[PDB]
Design a protein around this ligand. Structure first.
Ligand SMILES: Cn1cnc2ccc(-c3cc(N)nc(N)c3)cc21
Ligand SMILES: [Cl-]
Ligand SMILES: [Cl-]
Length: 329
């Protein structure tokens, strides 16, 4: 697709904004509404088309529920078929939270800005947890959270390409590795709690600048999690189909790691130190900055650890996250 190209007496293609496995996204001028739009053009291949059809049904499903909380999700304006490609038309948005991290030279944004992102994302998750919706994003990460305007801190989630309703799971290998939940790593059946896990991983990374758990593969990933959170509870591992990819069961001291050729011991890389709760924030770089008091850090550490609960049934849901002391006055 070239700049200038006109479609159906209606769309004037300008440029490529984004590319994907799914196809590509372009900045186009809508001649009818008299405004710029983002067009997500799916490749004319069964695989992407079928997955894109599910994205469109889930977005259309969301647009049917007018309430406060639906406005944290990219608005699908319309979709249509053209030159044998499915095309999704969305409102134009700005750069994503990865680029934002890139721009801070991976030094991270303030606890104050992290909080504003956190509250918006928790609100999105509460909206998707609507019983008649019950949508699991399955690919929450900085790159899939966009700024609404480059001047401002308003954010919106994008890419429902992997999304599925509760009990419409297709693939068991889902989520970006860095943001993959234990349950999905362990090959267990997954609910909306995996997005909360991802959100935990994301918020820490927005403030520190570096991923919380940057596994180079699933075995690596699980060890970097164990470094911070220790061994997962017996009852979770007893039920896990891929427990034995990572751990070994014995009679006494039921569960332990499968050591390879050599990370820190289980639960020793304390989140306390990762955050720099008592040491002036990440790399001490927040020493004496306001809204970076130890009281402020500890509230965040609590909320994050509630988000990184190993147990998805006791892991903090979105409603109770919004009512946390981290979001008070
Ligand atoms: C880069 N960019 C600017 N405005 C946008 C609006 C939407 C999208 C977009 C939405 C969905 N559902 N999936 C992908 N992969 C991209 C990207 C945008
Ligand atoms: Cl990333
Ligand atoms: Cl995925």
């Amino acid at each position: 697709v070239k700049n200038g190209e006109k479609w159906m007496d209606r769309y004037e293609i300008d440029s490529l904004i984004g590319k994907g496995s799914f196809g590509q996204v372009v900045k186009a001028y809508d001649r009818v509404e008299q405004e710029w739009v983002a067009i997500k053009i799916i490749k004319n291949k069964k695989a992407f088309l079928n997955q894109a059809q599910i994205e469109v049904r889930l977005l259309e499903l969301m647009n049917k529920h007018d309430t406060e909380m639906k406005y944290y999700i990219v608005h699908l304006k319309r979709h249509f078929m053209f030159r044998n490609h499915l095309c999704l038309v969305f409102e134009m948005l700005s750069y994503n939270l990865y680029d934002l991290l890139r721009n801070t030279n991976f030094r991270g944004v303030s606890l104050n800005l992290t909080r504003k992102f956190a509250q918006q994302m928790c609100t999105a998750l509460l909206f998707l947890a609507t019983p008649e919706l019950s949508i699991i994003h399955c690919d929450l990460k900085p790159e899939n959270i966009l700024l609404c305007n480059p001047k401002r801190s308003a954010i919106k989630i994008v890419d429902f390409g992997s999304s599925c309703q509760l009990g419409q799971r297709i693939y068991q290998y889902i989520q970006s590795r860095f943001y993959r939940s234990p349950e999905v790593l362990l090959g267990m059946p997954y609910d909306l709690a995996i997005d909360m896990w991802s959100l935990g991983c994301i918020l820490v990374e927005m403030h520190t600048g570096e991923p919380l758990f940057s596994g180079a593969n699933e075995v690596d990933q699980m060890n970097k999690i164990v470094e911070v959170l220790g061994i997962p509870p017996a009852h979770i591992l007893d039920q896990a189909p891929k427990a034995r990819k990572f751990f070994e069961k014995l009679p006494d001291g039921t569960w332990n790691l499968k050591k390879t050729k050599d990370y820190k011991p289980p639960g020793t890389r304390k989140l306390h130190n990762i955050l720099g709760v008592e040491t002036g924030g990440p790399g001490g770089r927040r020493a004496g900055e306001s809204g970076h008091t130890v009281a402020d850090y500890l509230k965040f550490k609590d909320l994050i650890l509630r988000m990184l609960d190993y147990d998805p049934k006791t892991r903090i849901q979105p409603y109770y996250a919004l009512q946390h002391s981290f979001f008070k006055k």
